Amino acid sequence: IGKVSGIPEEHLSRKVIIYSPARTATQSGSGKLGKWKINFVSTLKWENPLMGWTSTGDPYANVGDSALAFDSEEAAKSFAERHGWDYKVKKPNTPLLKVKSYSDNFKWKGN
Amino acid sequence: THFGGLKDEDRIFTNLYGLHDPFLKGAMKRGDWHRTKDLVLKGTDWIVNEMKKSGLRGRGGAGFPSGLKWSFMPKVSDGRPSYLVVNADESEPGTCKDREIMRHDPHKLLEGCLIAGVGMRASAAYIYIRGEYVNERLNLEKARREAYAAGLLGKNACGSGYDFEVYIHFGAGAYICGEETALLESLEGKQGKPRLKPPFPANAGLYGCPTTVTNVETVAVSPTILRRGPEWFSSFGRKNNAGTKLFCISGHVNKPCTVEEEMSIPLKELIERHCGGVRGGWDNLLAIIPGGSSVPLIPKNICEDVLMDFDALKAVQSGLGTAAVIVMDKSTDVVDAIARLSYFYKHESCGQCTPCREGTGWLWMIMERMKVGNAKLEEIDMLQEVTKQIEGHTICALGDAAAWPVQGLIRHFRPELERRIRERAEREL
Amino acid sequence: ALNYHLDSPDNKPDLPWEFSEANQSKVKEILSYYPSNYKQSAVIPLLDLAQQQNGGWLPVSAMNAVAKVIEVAPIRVYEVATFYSMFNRAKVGKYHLLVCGTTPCMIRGSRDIESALLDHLGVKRGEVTKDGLFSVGEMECMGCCVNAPMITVADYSNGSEGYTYNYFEDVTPEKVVEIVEKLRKGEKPPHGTQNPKRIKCGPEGGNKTLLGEPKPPQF
Amino acid sequence: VYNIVYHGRDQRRNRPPIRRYVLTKDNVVQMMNEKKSFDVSDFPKVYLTTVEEDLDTRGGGYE
Amino acid sequence: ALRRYPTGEERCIACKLCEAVCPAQAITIEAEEREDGSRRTTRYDIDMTKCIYCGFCQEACPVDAIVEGPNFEFATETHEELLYDKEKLLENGDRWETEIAENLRSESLY
Amino acid sequence: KYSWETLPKKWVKKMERSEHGNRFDTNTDYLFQLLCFLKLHTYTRVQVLIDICGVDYPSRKRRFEVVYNLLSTRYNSRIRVQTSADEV
Amino acid sequence: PTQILPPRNPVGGARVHFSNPEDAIEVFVDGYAVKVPKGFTVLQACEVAGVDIPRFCYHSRLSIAGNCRMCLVEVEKSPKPVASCAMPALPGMKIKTDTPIAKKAREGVMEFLLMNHPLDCPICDQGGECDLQDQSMAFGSDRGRFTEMKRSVVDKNLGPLVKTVMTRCIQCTRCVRFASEVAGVQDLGILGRGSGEEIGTYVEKLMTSELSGNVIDICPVGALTSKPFAFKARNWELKATETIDVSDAVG
Amino acid sequence: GNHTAKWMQDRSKKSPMELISEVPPIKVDGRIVACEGDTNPALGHPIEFICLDLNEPAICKYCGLRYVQDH
Ligand SMILES: Cc1cc2nc3c(=O)[nH]c(=O)nc-3n(C[C@H](O)[C@H](O)[C@H](O)COP(=O)(O)O)c2cc1C
Ligand code: SF4
Ligand code: SF4
Ligand code: SF4
Ligand code: SF4
Ligand code: SF4
Ligand code: FES
Ligand code: FES
Ligand SMILES: [Zn+2]
């Protein structure tokens, strides 16, 4: 389903990374986790020399992040394998909910 | 029945007014340290049982049934030496009943430290004197040195086999540090910021060791509760509320005084009898804050026949806290008085939790507006709603203690607030 | 009152500061009260001792010395010194007259007490007098409530020896100015109720309850 | 203005959750057997609209 | 036009709200703590050709830093001029401030 | 709704909604047959295909979702028959 | 009737670590039982239930605090909304995170936080990535009744890394706990009491500790922000790659 | 300046940094100021309350204006 999809040939030998975006460390809120996204590396972005702004050349610059977000690694892998991309799934690192309680702040250092 | 009459041989805090010597050779004459060896030998379970049977409730704002509180302490010691922090620190506005026990018969307080310590399996008592009570804690350290020299405290509890030593800590000017869960920390050395309740002081309090924080008046009537009759004690006050509270008639009474008197006493009877009367006669009364400052007002139409006991004053949409009755007559600006109370709760709020830390400065700003009249007639419903946002959410009951004065002021004197607002409106234009 | 430190030649962490003698013993005793560890418990008494020793205020060098004596990071000592109100962190002169201002005082003329005291001294509220002697500072409920208006002096003249935190209660503007003048003249006015006809915390017409001679009740 | 309680005024999130329950063959054969007859008023009403000539009678040409 | 505060000092603190709200993404903002210490935009370039003139930037800006001057007469012979440079040509709003301040003083009621 | 009682149960195969406009998420095989129903039917007369909205859900297995809108000028109602067909 | 309930997996795929499969306490989060190990705070007993309870000072790595009451879920038989961060889940406890009392408690607290807080969101470096902005725009009220003089705080010098604007800071104490515990240097402090509370070193003291630049990610508010990343970008412009680091061999 | 040398190539009109560093700091009474903007609270920046506990002038971040305690 890569050939019928009209995508040019040179963008079906692309190497993607099917990660799950970790939580933004700045804000302690999990409302953006569990949305697996293909990551077309799309690193090539120069600076259009007339003005200060940048200028990509890869068509898959933004769609990796924007508007292409699956809901499960199986669906994302099925997607990146239909289209014939070389996906390397990077598993998401999840937190241990280690047991913790308030009364541990007021622990007694014996003597 | 009809309460109020307490005879001079039934007052527990003799030498209240410091007329006689407070220390030993002057305390043994008043029955202090009389036969505490027998009491300690009577055991811990017997002490807790007689305190529960006497129905003694918390002399402090909490109003919790003492004895039952002392049964919360662990029986088998698991290495953590159970402490006993005495809440000498008050700092509640209106309350001097502690100041007349720390000085002026402190040996009752020390003997109560000992008797409650053997009562709750304690191992040391930290009398957290309020910081400003410098002369009071000097008298108390004098009496402590005495009770140490007289073999009463320390390495043998009054010659008994109980190792119990009383150390005297003193804070430094913080009403917030006085709270039960904040006493433990302000004494642990950290700031006087309360801890959350899920760890209860009886389970993990001072130094993480179990402990129970008791107001001096509850710990100090404990000796005479045991030496006299727990039936005799419970013979005062109404059914549930029983004992002889130490009152402090604070302001706008022609003869302000702190006087010990039976609980369940009619507030009007107390005012008219002991402290004289509301300045300018009872018909001059405007409002009364019956407990300390942590309690709503009483608008003088439900202050005639209200009894100074926990249950009735709670049923009158108020509370009996330290029973530091503050009286206000028709000459005062009651909104300015409650504005200064809210300023007090803004100042003495350790700021640990957001609902109090911020909303109390907010209550102070709204009160300093409404006392001039700068508000709008719907803010009196914001003020009610702001107070109800503060009340249930704060870590300790200071949030309560800061939402309750304003809540009571609104609930009762909403006509006066609305009148000030409308008068400001008509002053404009 | 800033909740942080602005260096000054009088007050900076460079200055060497340490408990003088006749106070090292008090330090040892205070630390003896609380256990070997948890000696942090003694930060309130040690800080108050440093405040008495340094004439009424806590320089940062003093907080650092208390931290060295008590073995916690100086931030914890700084946190407790800025938290508790009795710890003055800037010089408050020699006496620092603390006039209560809560409602049980406010309704009983404590605002007039403070205004009379201020206009007599001539300082805004908390500024120290040019004489360096006096300073006024509002304080919330001081316990002295039935003794309706009150004023607490903190005699910092001698230091940890003549340190008297006297309660001058039941005062009036005239009583307050008299107390201040008798304080600047050197002597120590008699504390307690500045209003006779009442014993301490008494009903103002002679107590009406505690009259009979105390004696062991029927046990 | 001075009553900013929101969860009562909320519209974005103050809605009943989606109740997506499955129907299996038993349920629909039960429903088909329960539907005994299609009496009138179990039928969708017609949006009746007829045309009627009018020149300027609405208000008299003045609105 | 990027407005200024009456006492000089470009009104444009670099929050990037207009760069965010822009439907056509015309505004490219790069920010740097200037030596004075107060944030400011090293690059504030609106691409007028890639701009829909919807006034979203005027609404989104918190301090009214970016406003649309009633100019509308700026047809340029060459496209590169039509890309309004970083805070230099949008800084020509100082000439239009006499009319922009008037329009804002009369519209702020809405 | 009357339309769900008469409609053969198999035709409304997968889903069915009851607000924001009602829909019969059907199967691709029974679609034009389902569109034959709701039109040329006395009590359900749509006659008007308002719109055919392709919707692409990449995370599904049947990627697209061809959302046929349908207006019923007679009974003044609007039904949104849907489907699901992937790229091939 | 053959409903299809959502899966209700943990909040962030959080692996729940049973110390043993015997002491699993079963609590009801919005009438949906969840088996949490013994000792889980109500907040963690809800993060096991997928319910994301708004927290300002509760960090899983850091200690537990009540410096604010943004969580306040209503458990079944308690008289007041219990702070979820410190209340340990008891077996059978019924946690109602969305009951009107819980939502009103959350709105109350998010009004107090935004009461003395300055309107620095445009000039705040963490304007987009802000717990306060994203909790006000999601759980806090749409309007604020406070129209008075907010309190303001000077900006402490905490070094060439952490730009400090303590006026924005909500005094949740998260950083003063991070520097005392994880960073272990003990320089930050909650100086003063009341609204006058100020977070930072009492004497001008650059945070000499390494590992103390993470206080910015710890900080739920712009107050503590990277001074190197002074204002150069925004939370939305930044395209993020989950790279690794090569400076030190900890990787 | 150097930051202002990135967007301004005129270098003849005074750089905004100098235009704001040459306006004197505004005396005030209390310990907190408003600086709502120019004059009209609706044509200035969101009101930014500044603390004046320090001795040096505390700038308003949005407008660059400076306030001193004036005790
Ligand atoms: C708002 C508040 C005010 C308090 N005020 C006092 C007080 O004035 N005196 C005191 O001894 N304890 C005070 N406490 C501490 C406890 O409420 C309680 O009084 C003490 O821990 C035990 O007293 P009891 O054993 O007589 O109940 C206060 C606590 C709170 C939360
Ligand atoms: S903010 Fe109020 S409730 Fe919270 S710890 Fe401080 S005084 Fe207690
Ligand atoms: S009007 Fe403003 S926000 Fe809209 S496209 Fe143009 S520059 Fe962008
Ligand atoms: S123009 Fe407005 S939105 Fe854009 S950076 Fe400046 S202040 Fe922010
Ligand atoms: S932290 Fe910054 S962005 Fe967030 S609400 Fe506060 S000022 Fe606004
Ligand atoms: S500086 Fe940040 S982390 Fe520290 S208390 Fe303030 S808001 Fe919390
Ligand atoms: S009135 Fe509270 S102590 Fe003077
Ligand atoms: S974060 Fe749990 S209540 Fe403050
Ligand atoms: Zn400004």
Author numbering:
A (entry chain O): 39 to 149
B (entry chain A): 53 to 481
C (entry chain B): 31 to 249
D (entry chain S): 67 to 129
E (entry chain D): 112 to 221
F (entry chain F): 8 to 95
G (entry chain C): 50 to 300
H (entry chain P): 38 to 108
What's in the article?
The plant mitochondrial complex I has the classical open L-shape formed by the matrix and membrane arms. The main feature of the plant complex I is the presence of an additional globular matrix-exposed domain, bound to the membrane arm. This domain is formed by a trimeric complex, the carbonic anhydrase (CA).
Focused refinement and particle polishing were performed in RELION314 (see “Methods” section), allowing reconstruction of the full complex I at 3.7 Å resolution, focused classification on the membrane arm and PP module yielding 3.4 Å. The cryo-EM maps allowed the determination of many well-resolved features and clear side-chain densities that enabled modeling of the 45 proteins of the plant mitochondrial complex I, as well as several characteristic ligands that were directly identified from the density: the eight canonical FeS clusters of the matrix arm, the FMN of the 51 kDa subunit, the NADPH molecule in the 39 kDa subunit, three cardiolipins two phosphatidylinositol and one phosphatidylethanolamine. Similarly to the previously obtained complex I structure, the supernumerary subunits, specific to mitochondrial complex I, form a shell around the core subunits, adding nearly 400 kDa of proteins to the conserved subunits. Our results confirm the recently observed ubiquinone position described for Y. lipolytica. Here, the overall structure of the γCA is conserved: it is a trimer composed of characteristic left-handed beta-helix monomers, forming triangular prisms. Hence the only conserved active site is at the interface of the two γCAs, which we confirmed by visualizing both the zinc and an additional density most likely corresponding to HCO3−. Interestingly, the CA domain is in tight interaction with a peculiar lipid complex positioned below the latter and between the plant specific P2 and proteins B14.5b and Nad2, close to the Nad2–Nad4 junction.
